[PDB]
């Protein structure tokens, strides 16, 4: 999951976020997992706004699991709002199981959407909005660690936000998640230093961000097409193999991909720089 690294960093729950669970009628299950699901719902009056906005609710495994949902909610209250990010609206932590309420994204995940099918204006759009999201997480020294297309959601306007299905994601049955000890990690999206040296930074998320780019401009090809994950693979990234340019990337964008896939973390760009190169 997404952790807070050491701009400048300075975590108990704030009861301001609290919401009467009494004002929620659930809908269809939007996704489900090894310890959790996520569901359509409607919220009867959150904020003097006093709306009836449609929302997603996450929910739960023993107290080993409780811990991490609260920690999740903690993190999401430390960061505060941003438009290209899935925003915490509220929570119900009393009178029942923990419920975490977030914004809703009608069009769902970017990977399925890209497969279901849109212009190279729209890819530049998607690419720029997610860049705005990570740049925001980066600025709070928040790392994500599963930056992939499947975890980009499309909301009102087909506008992109980064979230994380996390608990509500069937990792166990997803072959994009290889085994490694207790954990199961998205190896094809990981910077080398994370695979080999278990080190994870903002600059690590940049590696993953370059993969997202390869997805976006392949319209949802699984990365390293046909290449299995085993002895040969790890060597190729240690050697410094790189995916070829995808079909619909203007060469400019492929250079962005290659920047991100620099081996020494300290020579990859930042989300701000990426954000700024997309301004032009
Ligand atoms: C995906 C997803 N992510 C998050 N993540 C989250 O809060 N993240 C963060 O805080 C970080 C710091 C990692 C950015 C939370 C919930 C969630 O669940 C949704 C949300 C909206 N919409 C659908 C949905 C699914 N299908 N449809 C049609 C809508 C599913
Ligand atoms: Cl109680
Ligand atoms: Cl935007
Ligand atoms: Cl796939
Ligand atoms: Cl070109
Ligand atoms: Na798996």
Swiss-Prot record:
Keywords annotated in UniProt: ATP-binding, Cell membrane, Disease variant, Disulfide bond, Glycoprotein, Immunity, Immunoglobulin domain, Inflammatory response, Innate immunity, Kinase, Membrane, Neurodegeneration, Nucleotide-binding, Phosphoprotein, Proto-oncogene, Receptor, Repeat, Signal, Transferase, Transmembrane, Transmembrane helix, Tyrosine-protein kinase, Ubl conjugation
Modified residues (Phosphotyrosine): 8, 177
Domain notes: The juxtamembrane domain functions as autoinhibitory region. Phosphorylation of tyrosine residues in this region leads to a conformation change and activation of the kinase.
Whole-protein coverage range: 549 to 912 of 972
This protein's record includes keyword RNA-binding: no
Region feature Activation loop, mapped onto this chain: 164-186
One GO CC term on file: nucleoplasm
Organism per entry: Homo sapiens (Human)
Outcome recorded upon mutating residue 170 to V: Constitutive kinase activity. Loss of inhibition by imatinib
Tissue: Expressed in bone marrow and in differentiated blood mononuclear cells.
Family: Belongs to the protein kinase superfamily. Tyr protein kinase family. CSF-1/PDGF receptor subfamily.
Domain of life: Eukaryota
Name the UniProt record assigns to this protein: Macrophage colony-stimulating factor 1 receptor
Disease tied to this protein: Aberrant expression of CSF1 or CSF1R can promote cancer cell proliferation, invasion and formation of metastases. Overexpression of CSF1 or CSF1R is observed in a significant percentage of breast, ovarian, prostate, and endometrial cancers. Aberrant expression of CSF1 or CSF1R may play a role in inflammatory diseases, such as rheumatoid arthritis, glomerulonephritis, atherosclerosis, and allograft rejection.
Residues annotated as catalytic: 146
Effect of residue 143 to N: In HDLS1; impairs autophosphorylation upon stimulation with CSF1
Result for mutant: residue 162 to T: In HDLS1; impairs autophosphorylation upon stimulation with CSF1
Outcome of mutating residue 243 to T: In HDLS1; impairs autophosphorylation upon stimulation with CSF1
């Amino acid at each position: 999951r997404w952790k807070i690294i050491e701009s400048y960093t300075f975590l108990p729950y704030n009861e301001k976020w609290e919401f009467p669970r009494n004002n929620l009628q659930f809908g269809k299950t939007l996704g489900a997992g090894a310890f959790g699901k996520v569901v359509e719902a409607t919220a009867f009056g959150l904020g003097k706004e006093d709306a009836v906005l449609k929302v997603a609710v996450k929910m739960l495994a023993h107290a080993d699991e409780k811990e991490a949902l609260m920690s999740e909610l903690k993190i999401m209250s430390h960061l505060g709002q941003h438009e290209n990010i899935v925003n915490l609206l509220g929570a119900c932590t009393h009178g029942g199981p923990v419920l975490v309420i977030t914004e809703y994204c009608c069009y769902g995940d970017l990977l399925n959407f890209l497969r279901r099918k849109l212009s190279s204006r729209d890819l530049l759009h998607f690419s720029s909005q997610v860049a705005q999201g990570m740049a925001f997480l980066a600025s709070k020294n928040c790392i994500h660690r599963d930056v992939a297309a499947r975890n980009v959601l499309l909301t009102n306007g087909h506008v992109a936000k980064i979230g994380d299905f996390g608990l509500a994601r069937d990792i166990m049955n997803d072959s994009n998640y290889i085994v490694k000890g207790n954990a199961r990690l998205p190896v094809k999206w990981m910077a080398p230093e994370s695979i080999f040296d278990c080190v994870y930074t903002v600059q690590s998320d940049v590696w993953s961000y370059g993969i997202l780019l390869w997805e976006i401009f392949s319209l949802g090809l699984n990365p390293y097409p046909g290449i299995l994950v085993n002895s040969k693979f790890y060597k190729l990234v240690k050697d410094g193999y790189q995916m070829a340019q995808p079909a619909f990337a203007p060469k400019n964008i492929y250079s962005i991909m290659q920047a991100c896939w620099a081996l020494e973390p300290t020579h990859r760009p930042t989300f701000q720089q990426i954000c700024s190169f997309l301004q032009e």
